[PDB]
Amino acid sequence: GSRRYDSRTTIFSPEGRLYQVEYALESISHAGTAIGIMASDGIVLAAERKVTSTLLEQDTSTEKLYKLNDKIAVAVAGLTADAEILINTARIHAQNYLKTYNEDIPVEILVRRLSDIKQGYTQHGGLRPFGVSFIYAGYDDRYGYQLYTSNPSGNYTGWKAISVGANTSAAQTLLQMDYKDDMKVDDAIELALKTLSKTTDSSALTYDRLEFATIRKGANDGEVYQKIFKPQEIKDILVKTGIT
Amino acid sequence: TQQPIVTGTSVISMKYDNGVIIAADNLGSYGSLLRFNGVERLIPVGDNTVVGISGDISDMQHIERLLKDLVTENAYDNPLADAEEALEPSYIFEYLATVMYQRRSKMNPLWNAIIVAGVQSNGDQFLRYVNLLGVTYSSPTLATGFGAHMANPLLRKVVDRESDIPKTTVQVAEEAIVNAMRVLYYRDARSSRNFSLAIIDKNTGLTFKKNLQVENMKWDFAKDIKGYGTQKI
């Protein structure tokens, strides 16, 4: 019968590893680097677009940074199509929570549920896992500013600063070196860009090859604002830090 | 939940020494309208059984189709289909009785009253009744509808108990049935003059009589009846 053609996506190796999860992580390691840095008064999300062409429409484009709700955003590393499936599910889950409790969903609860979906694909169903790693940046009234990451295994962890995708080993060393706890958003913006600038596989880091976003309490009195940076705004912040 | 539309009235029957007789008129009533006049309500199954059906005619035609299909199915992979493993009256009855009770238990009955008349392989007479409720009973005489009220009393004067069956001939039994059909024509408003009659004998087999008529009727005394009490002219 059909047994002959089954790859058996949800099995253990002799060493106790999940083949498909490991190979999905290998796929993600070739994706454009994405960095998240958490400050005391906000969060930064920075991501490198995958080898840009000059005729690509840059201003009306979205590849790396997606909005989940007014208080939570994600940076993507891996297959974009896979990420969008998961993103729509996460958007729906956030609204279900708001409908039920009349309160915005706590960041971890959203992360846990999305990670539990990934876990399912590794344990049952016989389907390939989602080839995606997320960096979740968000705010709630319980824990304040929070950074998480999830990967195809469905395992998630919290971070002060973290990178996913390509050159994470080199990127994590640079972040570990220059990061400190009393850091501001404006300083974190500078760290994120400097790190990408050194770890990039490109010749020089430019505005057209980047996506950028912040989550500050920079709005008027005790409320959070999401800023997805425009092309011209990235051009300005790149000059202001002295990279170009 | 149903309501019957086109209906057939009484079916009457009795046992005699060597077999059974069954009869029913050829009418399909549509309420008070006597709409259809060429309706056969006696349906033979093989050469040893006759099923007489009253009530809803659309449901009767459905049962005809089931019995016809039953004969076909019994012949499959059956070298003795025309011998030892042929369909018996008791087999045909139990099948119908199962169906009738199952349909009443689904609140969607076959709106019929059925009498299965025949002779078994060992020569024993078979006569049993079943209706829309799945109710079953057997008796030396059986009748449905008005026949139960008017025919049974006449047929029970011939065969009042089991011991009267060997004493009753086919000539006497047929005479009583034909007389009963006349009485029903006198007194049942949804009956017709034309009818069918079937005899299943253990020796002479199945005899199926069509296009019979009620005859030797008494109507002459009607001319002497005037008014409703006092009237003289």
Partner: protein
Amino acid sequence: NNYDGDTVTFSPTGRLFQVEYALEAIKQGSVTVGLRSNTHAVLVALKRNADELSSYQKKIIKCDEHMGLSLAGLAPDARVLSNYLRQQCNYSSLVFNRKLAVERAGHLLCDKAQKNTQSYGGRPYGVGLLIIGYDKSGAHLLEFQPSGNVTELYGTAIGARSQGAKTYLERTLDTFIKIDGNPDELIKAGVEAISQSLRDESLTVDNLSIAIVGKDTPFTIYDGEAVAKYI
């Protein structure tokens, strides 16, 4: 070799290896014999034990008052097929007030075994059956094989060393067929038949198993001291 992974695959010579491997399970099973006259039908079965401390595996199963079988091979598969026969016999009685013909019983078993040999996932039944019975056309003996093939016979035997008993019955055909109105003599012929398949072991009181059905005899099984008469 490459064509025996499942029942859905034909070999280049047109063989179904899984069905043949199921047939092999019957050959390993203990011997059982079936034979009939015109009035009665008899099953004789050599029961097998695990060791001296264990009981002897029951080989004969009753299906109705007028029908039953003996098994050889996987016993659980016989339980499934015998249960199916019990239901079919019972359906015939409740719906049609009719005792199920032994021939139809065979046709129903054939069709049930067949479906398991044409579909992916499932497996063939790993047991052979000898069905006896008395119906409206007299006494009957059937041989069921899990390939689906059912055969009506005067006498037969299945299991290990069944060729010896089968040869004997082929010689004795003219004699035992005319044993009418005599149960004990028909059994004796069956006990002598199964004896031709014995090696080193002999028929003891808790080893032998006999069953009979006939004209004025319901399907009944004899075990223990009740078979001491025939040793």
